[PDB]
Every structure is written in C-alpha cells, then in structure tokens.
Subunit: 121 residues, 2 copies
C-alpha cells in the first residue's frame, strides 16, 4: 500500500510512479489520448508526512509532452491527493498548457480531472 | 532556453530553477525575505526543444508545502509557458490541492494564476 506503483486513469493511461522518502515523485506516463505516443518522463512532489486525521496525501506531477517519438510542445500538471483503502485511488485535476504565440495565449490551457486506481477500470 | 535563474511573482514569492538539457526543472521556491522556514523543493519538466515560430516554451512544476520546519499538507502545480526577450516572463495557471477527508474533498482545490519576471520587485 502507498503511492509507489502502477496506476491507470479512467481513459486507459498508465502512470508508473515511485514515491521517494524525500518527497520526490519519479517515473513514466503513457497517455491513451491526445498528441502522445509511448512513455514520457514525469517528476513531481508529494507530502511525505501526511496528517493523521483521515485526510488524503497531497501530491502533484508534471509531464512535458516531448520524447524520442513526438513533441507536442505542451505540458500537463496533475494536482490531487492519494486516498488509501481496499480500493486505493488518486483523485486529480489537471492543466494542459501549450506553447503559443501571444495572440493565441488566451486559449493555451485545457482543464480536466483524472481519477487513478491500481486496478485498471 | 532562458529559463535557468531566479524568478519573482507579483505577491512576494521567488524561485530559483535550473533547466536541465534533458527537460528537467529543479530548484527551490521561497519568499521574498528568504528565510529557511519559507523554502521548499521545486521539481518539474519543460519542453527542451520548443518551436521556433515565436511560440512560448511549455513547462510545469510542483511544490509540496512540506519542509523541515512546517507542513501545510498541500501541493501546488503551476502549468504555463516561458516567453523570452528583454522582458522575459513565465505565465502560469496553478492548482493548489490540500489533503482532505472524502466529505471535504469537493473543496480541496484552489485555482489561480501567477506571472513571473526576472526583475526583483
């Protein structure tokens, strides 16, 4: 039990993460949607000493959508919390910002929400 | 890439970041006064091969609000783009998620926007 492991979101993406003792998140992300192919590097942070009152564990991570196969000139950040239990879950909201000209910057950012489970839905 | 260095927002915060050749963002996020109790690890990713058509450079990073002195049980992710030139800027939107119980999860996430400059206010 814990954050370290392989997770899947509701759209079939694969989030392979390690939670280090120092609060570091590392691993790879593979998206089933969008301008993306194969695995991408992710890095992020999580609360390594969460509250003991029943609250979830806050965390966030970033993927820049460049790898050896494609470059979408964009990056997604997921912000959320880990919730333990017999059906562990990470609930997130995300922002996907593209590199744009100034005239197009107003429409540079998509917003959404992803839920991750260790059992693929 | 023009990203490595010290950046300042509109509300008295500062971060020092190194943009690695591979796409890594690493550094420290802190307050204007710069005391140790206000400093936190920052980690993220950026597009290390941006477009050459005048578009910005997509990037994102996370700070979990725990250091050796305090812990807010929360984390912010900034998603945005770097725009170069004599008045360089990092223009972001952010999500700040707190660890909560399930009953309070509906109100776990704040949203906002931050612009960063290289010039100390």
């Amino acid at each position: 039990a814990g954050i370290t492991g392989t997770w899947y979101n509701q759209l079939g993406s694969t989030f392979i993460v390690t939670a280090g003792a120092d609060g570091a998140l590392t691993g790879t992300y593979e998206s089933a949607v969008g301008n993306a192919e194969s695995r991408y590097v992710l890095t992020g942070r999580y609360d390594s000493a969460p509250a003991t009152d029943g609250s979830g564990t806050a965390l966030g991570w970033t993927v820049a959508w460049k790898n050896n196969y494609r470059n979408a000139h964009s990056a997604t950040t997921w912000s959320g919390q880990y919730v333990g239990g017999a059906e562990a879950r990470i609930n997130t909201q995300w922002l996907l910002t593209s590199g744009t000209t100034e005239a197009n910057a107003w429409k540079s950012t998509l917003v959404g929400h992803d839920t991750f489970t260790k059992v693929k839905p």
